[PDB]
Amino acid sequence: CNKQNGVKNILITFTHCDTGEVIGPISHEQPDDTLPTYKTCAWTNTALTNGAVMRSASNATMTLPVVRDPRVPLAWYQGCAQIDAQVEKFDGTVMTLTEGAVTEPEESDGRAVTMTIIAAEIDELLPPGSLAA
Amino acid sequence: CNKQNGVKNILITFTHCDTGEVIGPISHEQPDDTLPTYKTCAWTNTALTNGAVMRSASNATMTLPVVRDPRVPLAWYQGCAQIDAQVEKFDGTVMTLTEGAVTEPEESDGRAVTMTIIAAEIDELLPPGSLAA
Amino acid sequence: CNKQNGVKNILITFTHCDTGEVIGPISHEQPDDTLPTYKTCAWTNTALTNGAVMRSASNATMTLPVVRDPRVPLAWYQGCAQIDAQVEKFDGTVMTLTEGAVTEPEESDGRAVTMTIIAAEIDELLPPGSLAA
Amino acid sequence: CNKQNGVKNILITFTHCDTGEVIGPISHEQPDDTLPTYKTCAWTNTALTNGAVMRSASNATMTLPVVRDPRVPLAWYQGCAQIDAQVEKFDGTVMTLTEGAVTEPEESDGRAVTMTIIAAEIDELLPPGSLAA
Amino acid sequence: CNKQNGVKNILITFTHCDTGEVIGPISHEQPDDTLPTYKTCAWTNTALTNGAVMRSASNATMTLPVVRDPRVPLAWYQGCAQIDAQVEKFDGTVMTLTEGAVTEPEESDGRAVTMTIIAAEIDELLPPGSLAA
Amino acid sequence: MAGPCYNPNEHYLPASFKGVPFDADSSDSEHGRNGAEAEFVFGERTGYADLGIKIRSYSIRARFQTNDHVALSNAFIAVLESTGPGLLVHPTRGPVMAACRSARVTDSKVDAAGVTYIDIDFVEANDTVTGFG
Secondary structure: OOOOOOOEEEEEEEEEOOOOOOOOOOOOOOOOOOOOOOEOOOOHHHHHHOOEEEEEEOEEEEEEEEEEEOOOHHHHHHHOOOEEEEEEEOOOOOEEEEEEEEEEOOOOOOEEEEEEEOOOOOEEEEEOOOOOO | OOOOOOEEEEOOOEEOOOOEOOOOEEEEOOOOOOOEEEEEOOOEEEEOOOEEEEEEEOEEEEEEEEEOOOOOOOHHHHHEEEEEEEEEEEOEEEEEEEEEEEEOOOOOOEEEEOOOOOOOOOOOEEEOOOOOO | OOOOOEEEEEEEEEEEEOOOOEEEEOOOOOOOOOEEEEOOOEEEEEEEEHHEEEEOOOOEEEEEEEEEOOOOHHHOOOOOEEEEEEEEEEEOOEEEEEEEEEOOOEEEOOOOEEEEEEEEEOEEEEOOOOOOO | OOOOOOOEEEOOOOEOOOOOOOOOOOEEOOOOOOOOEEEEEOOEEEEOOHHHHEEEOOOEEEEEEOOOOOOHHHHHOOOEEEEEEEEEEEOOOEEEEEEEEEEOOOEEEEEEEEEEEEEEEOOEEOOOOOOOO | OOOOOOEEEEEEOOOOOOOOOOOEEEOOOOOOOOEEEEEEOEEEEEEOOOOOOEEOOEEEEEEEEEEOHHHHHHHHOOOOOOOOOEEEEEEOEEEEEOEEEEEEOOEEEOOOOEEEEEEOOOOOEEOOOOOOO | OOOOOOHHHHOOOOOOOOOEEEOOEEEEEEEEEOOOOOOOOOOOEOOOOOOOEEOOOEEEEEEOOOOOHHHHHHHHHHOOOOOOOOOEEOOEEEEEEEEEEEEEEEOOOOOOOEEEEEEEEEOOOOOOOOOOO
16 A cells, blocks of 8 residues: 555654753654645745745744653643654655754643644655655 | 646656756646646736726746655755646646746645746647637 | 626627737626626725715726636736726626726636726616616 | 514615716615614724723714615715615614715625715614603 | 523613713613623733733723613614613622723614623622632 | 715816926925024013014925826926926915925836826925015
8 A cells, every 4th residue: 555645653752951861762643634744945935026036044844743642741742852753654755853843832732732843954765766866 | 528627737847956957757646626827927017096007027927736746855846946847738728837936835744735836937828729829 | 587687798809018919809708606896986985083084096997707718818818918898787787998907917727717907987888767867 | 563673665865976966765675684784973982991981083884785776877876976865674763864975885796785874973763752852 | 590601680771971861770681692791800911921920900891782772772872871781690690880881882783782881890799608708 | 075075176276387287196385483482591481572484385296107107207307407486386275486496206117117206395486686675
């Protein structure tokens, strides 16, 4: 099954800034039928007149809705800890992120958390048989 | 079948801007029931008083929702590469675009991408029997 | 049948601005169940205190959703050509417009085009038996 | 039948500004299930701190959705003529307006018109047996 | 029945501000299934940094949707008169207000009026057995 | 203005200068009287002395929308620079004699193509004999 659009594994690795603790790559499960969304192009374009474009810095963003693990404080999932995430889709694509930070956390009832992460770059592992280098 | 409103073929030809490699014209398919949209008049009017108008530069744009090819990095479909697109509707119309650029990309889940493209000029091929030159 | 509310005929005449070409009045057909709208009073009132008003120039505008003719370039229906339009309703009313211009065109999929037109004045032909002179 | 909330008679009397013509009190009918709304107090209160208030001039406003009469130009129904209206509800209340003016007209398809009127004051005639003088 | 959320009696006592006449306490009924709403704390807090708060004046308000009494002019139910209201809920709670003022009235069709009232203080009568003094 | 029977073309005079018509878009003025306010020292009383009339000043704004506005606009500037004062028909103050003191011509090619604005600053100028009294 290769044409199924879905998520297979989610691994996260916290790092408490205030104490330096590190927690192994725990696995997670998603809360609902939504999927994560990605943006891997660092620079951003703007529309000038007559086909030109302005180029701005911007960042690389992530959006990871995941069920909270009942053995980790809720604070860590918000902007009180570093994050290192990996998502493996069914087809085979694997996307990794390191040294990410959470931005503008919103209130969560205790189970569903929707993290917004930003990092310098995101590395993508396409299935076998890619074209670009 | 000339009264059927739909898209027949979609061809794209990327050109990586940091290595110069070119990927030949690949075919694509639609993600949903929506259709592309067009605007070919470069100048834009605004309403003055008593029937007059003001003309401004503006550009010619494109909106092309297409399913990501599983053999091309997701970055290319965003603002990290050039695009050359062609769309052939069922009735026979063909809309060509070259040296296009992607503007203000939004996050995608890895399958569906809605590209916004701007170019100096878009050329249209009407079916046989056109009136205007 | 006079109480039926609908549109009976729609004639449009195009005058290309960069070449002077003129295309005779071509009948058109509407894309959906919506109807055109009108505004003929070329003066706007603003509410002051104690029942007084203020006059401002404003214009007379028409919104005309029509189905693109497959023998005319899509650019003409947008702000790249002059328009002369006539609409005849079932009851008998006729609304004529000349030397109109298209304003702030939006993207169209290639079949359905909604045109916003502004002109110095719109002339109305009421059915037989009017009261006002 | 005094408990029925509805409109019974609508009388309007136009007065062309540019020619001094006057049209008798023609009767009208409403286009849909909505009802007119009224505001008869020409002073507005703003909330200060600790229960105080501030008074502002404001005006007396009316909202009269009525079907266009096919013997009167559409322009008259917009801000190109004076209006004198009267609305008689089923219960008995009669409310009259004189020397009103239309403000900020919107586009209409030729049958349904929603006039917004402003005047110095609106006179209300309560059914027999009122309390206030 | 002591757990039914609803309103039992509504009493209003107008006081015309231009003639000084007073109309005794009249009973009213509701226009729909909505209920009044209250705010009894005069001061208002705002969020500072690190758990602090800023305190501002504000007022005590009230929202009272009621059916217009067919023996009272529609003007009195807006900024053009004073109000003294009382609401008795089914459980036994009684809210009293005196020397209230109507703010920013909106147009009404002639039957349903949604008055907004502000006063220096609103007094609440809890059922027997209250804890706080 | 009150009432909907106003007619701006009937109350505002058509502007002009040295006999060349032009389209006015605004009308201001400045009047006054020269005083000699004086306040004594250690005193509870002040004084005043009227000492002549103050020189007026008018400011107007013009708009050119017609086809080929540059020729008319560029030809009107040649009149403002003509030596000596001349008759001015102020839209509201009537015919007066004034001399142009400055004029800023605003234009653009992409932001606003097809309309030219020009602000003016007039000064009252009454002819005087040359023999100094």
